[model samples]
Target: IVGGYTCGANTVPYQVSLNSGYHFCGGSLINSQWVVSAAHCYKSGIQVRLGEDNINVVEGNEQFISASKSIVHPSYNSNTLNNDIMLIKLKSAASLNSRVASISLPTSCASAGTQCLISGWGNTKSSGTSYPDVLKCLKAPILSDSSCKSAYPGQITSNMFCAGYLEGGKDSCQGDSGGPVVCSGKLQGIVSWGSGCAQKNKPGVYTKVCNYVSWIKQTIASN
Candidate 1:
């Protein structure tokens, strides 16, 4: 793994703080003007850059969109990170540059039997350092809905998606929260919580989009 954190195997697109050279994980484009990401990143001050390269993200054609306003999920409480989701409005619109394109959301959510995708810049081996300059991501099979019951059973709400590597050492960590998860080229999930970054029997958790449709739709239209 490049930095231990892969945004969906290179799927996590970050908003770079050029002044500090520090990068925070953000979701891929769900629409040319919308970036689905975590509200906490905004609380920390990060911006989204599309079609940017490692060397000069600011000089790219896809362009970086300064967040005009971030609508955090009304219920997003850091204590539980329940409404961890948010919609990032871009100051400018983007075109398909290189691999730059918005991701698609689902109209419905699946239970334990269905599968989705995820991406982020978490530690490679849980509790590890996030990548300094590179992005790394991995693939995981969807577990049964009942899977989370065994792990986060009590905290497992229908709004969360569960994924894990049964073998070990594969999950999202500290800096990777709020990134994207892609399956079948469609943006599906965002990294939320995991078993201390990476550990056996502890799959990472995510906020489910299927249930947040009304809030997301209303927020976007008003913008």
Candidate 2:
């Protein structure tokens, strides 16, 4: 897994378009027929674009394979977002001569406080809100369980992991949910939620990819 995808690194980014192409966030392809993204990304028409290097400049970009099937975790709730996760199966395997990066599920990740990377095509400044056509990237320190437990008592669950600074300014933003949160170049989490875009008291939280390991394997195996 990679951090939020950049315009250059990820060829085809799975994205859900809200307000009819007004903007898009990010998602990842796990295999030929499956792409994984947050359940929130299912709100609008999401298309997975397959390509490489610069998304804006890549030619012969194939239209995203429509999701042949979708399954939102039964525990998913819009309110607290307990299980804000989903899987998309492409009608067919994505065909791209260039190597397509596979978003791998984490076996086990480092205990909290391990540093990681989060990238996206979002506002350059954490506070300012803008979804850039070109993607951007950032580095954040994963918060220790002890640290995260202290910050958000009721919200942080074992199924989740936290990152970012307590003082704020650095974080995943509005358009970053569903994108990968990578540690040691492996996808360990997906942007889940926070106090706000860049709240000082609350660190950004992500879906614990490891917790969903069995489900992911079953889903992909069926495909």
Candidate 3:
């Protein structure tokens, strides 16, 4: 995350790293057996690492679990990035502890100007590879749909929303996709896409989690 600071240990227990051999995306543990992330981050042989503070070190609190199944939203559009949410079922339930826990899902939608916390180990710079060893977080306010539409004309959809500074800085970049955007202690958004990492008039776009709550529950129940 650009213009963010390192997170304290155990500060974000719900935060998880979606990894193959290395951290590629971030996700949130919604329950003991289910995780929520962006559909665009989907790949085979994903390993979910829970209770991770630093991706470069072997934190004793971490729990590495393989994905049993990955279910992407059937309506997900790659071109428009609509319905960008995805659910991953863990092979086994995670052990909840001080360092590993699940976050509550949102029951209501967050309004415009709501201050949200976004965390990830993605690029700190807008360009180049600068993935931080420690997780980074930033506070970004949700923009109104009108403002979001103005920023990315013909791109913003009802299933998506925008956050971050329009002037540039404080955004979720590459490798941050599928990370959590928590507002009011609830998972509200999922890092999805943007024009450029933290650029002027180009805010970070996220999958609107509120729009998919029922879908998530149904998917989990049926699976």
Candidate 4:
């Protein structure tokens, strides 16, 4: 339902739809029982659905699991959107099948101008009231924090980065929050926030996953 074309079924195996009694945000399965998403999207009744492309009906390839616990970053700042990443632990480990799988985490930071893909079940239009039923995806160019600093001006932080076009035609919006931004065949970012959907010079902001790898590892180990 986001601003893109329909993705082939099971094209993005790691993509997971996070539901809170409704299809709300998107996430990426980083492991058999761990989902990476935006802390701001955390809510009660949160559940993770793997290998899903549509939300209206249950697909045979899909596997649903209730979240046992939600772990938001202790440093997360709602005001500035800093450290807006989170990890959701599943009640039981997901059964990895052909359609359900995990994505690889990045060992290095993404570079500027690297073409990446962002997929979610968010709204198709910026002002639309309805969310998409099918998973939506679009390819966007990654921008360095330096480039985004001008658009966000003092808002872009080291823990975050930007992606999408400045022309204002394509981007991830509401309902797309906590989605995956896959780059170089690895998990790179989490859809965090944006001024508006596909706004001029106001590209989508994301939590730099690489910056929090150590924290994620420690949190998972401790939990």
Candidate 5:
């Protein structure tokens, strides 16, 4: 995000660093053994680091866990970017502690205009290489579906939503995919995709979590 800075120490306990041999995406801890992220974020050699703040330094409280299985949503469509959510099953359950915890999933969709927070190690500027070495976070207000559709036309579907400044600046750029969009202490959306970072009228688009609540529950129950 353009105006983001290092996050508060141990503040976002559920935030996770996904390493596909390197920091590739962000994820949210939904439980001891489960992580939720965007399906398009997946790649080989993926592992997760919880309780992590700095990418270079392995904090004492950090929990490194290997993914035993990655379950991409069966209906996920790369072409249209629909059903972009997925779950990652840890090889072993996480050892929850003060620095490590799970985030709550939303029971309903947050209303438009609700300010939400998104954090990750994405590039600080559009198409720049200066991705943060530490976790970075920023607050973005939700854009109405009509407003988003006006910008994206047929691209913004009911399963997706937008957040960020409309005038340009402050948005989730590359490598921020699969991160959480938290509102009211609940997971409201998952960073899926966007146009150029922090571009005018092109807000960051996310997979609406509320639309897949039942699917998430079903996947968890079966696994």
Candidate 6:
């Protein structure tokens, strides 16, 4: 995350790292056996690491699990990045504890100006590579739909929303895709796309979790 600080160990317990040999994306533990992430991050043989603070260390609290199955949104559009969400069933259930837990999904949509917490191991610099070893987090407010649309005309969709400083300085960047955007302790968004990392007038866009509550429930119930 850009302009963020290292998170306290286990402070953001629901955050998980998606790895394919290396940390590539972030995800949220929505249940003991399920994780929600960005469809764009999907790949074969994804390893999910729970309760991880520093990716470089062998943290005793960490749980390494494989993805038993992954389901990407049927209507996901890679070109426009619409419906950019995915679900992964873990090979084994996570052992929930103070250092590992699940985050609740939002029941309703968050309003504009709602300050949300976004955490991940993404780059701290906007223009260059600088993935943090420890998890990082930043507080950014949800931007109005109109404002978001204006910033990126013809790109913003109803299923997507923006959250960040309009003047730039903080945001989720590469390696942070699929990470949690928690609002009021609920999973509200998934880091999806942006013009550039934390650039002025180019706030980070996220998948609107509120619109997919039913899909998430139905998918988990059936699979």
Tens-digit lDDT track for model 3 on 92-150? Answer: 99999978989999999999999999999889998776778888999999999998999
TM-score of 2: 0.83
What are the C-alpha RMSDs, in order, of all predicted structures? 3.5, 3.6, 0.8, 1.2, 1.0, 0.6
How far does residue 79 in candidate 4 sit from its true spot (Å)? 0.8
- Per candidate, the number of residue pairs that clash is 21, 2, 0, 1, 0, 0
| Clashes (candidate 2) | 2
Candidate 5, RMSD to the unseen true structure: 1.0
Instruction: List ranges where model 5 is wrong by over 4 Å.
Output: none
lDDT of 4 by residue, 33-83 (tens): 999999999888898989898788877788889999999999999999899
Model 1 earns a TM-score of 0.82
Residue 33 displacement in candidate 6 (angstroms): 0.4
Candidate 1 residue-pair clash tally: 21
TM-score of 4: 0.96
**Residue-wise lDDT of candidate 2 within 99-125, one digit each (tens)?**
455655678866777787776555545
The residue-by-residue lDDT of candidate 1 on 1-97, one tens digit each, is 2124333222334322211135566466777777777766555344666654452334444365576667788888877767678787777776654
The whole-model C-alpha lDDT of candidate 1 against the native structure comes to 0.62
Model 6, 72-149: lDDT tens digits are 999998998999999999999999998999999999999999999999999899888877899999999999999999
Worst 10 residues of 6 by lDDT: 123-132
- lDDT (0-100) at residue 155 of candidate 6? 92
Give the per-residue Cα lDDT of candidate 6 at 185: 92
Best by TM-score: 6
Q: TM-score-based ranking, best first?
A: 6, 3, 5, 4, 2, 1
lDDT of 3: 0.93
How well does each candidate superpose onto the true structure, as a TM-score?
0.82, 0.83, 0.98, 0.96, 0.97, 0.99
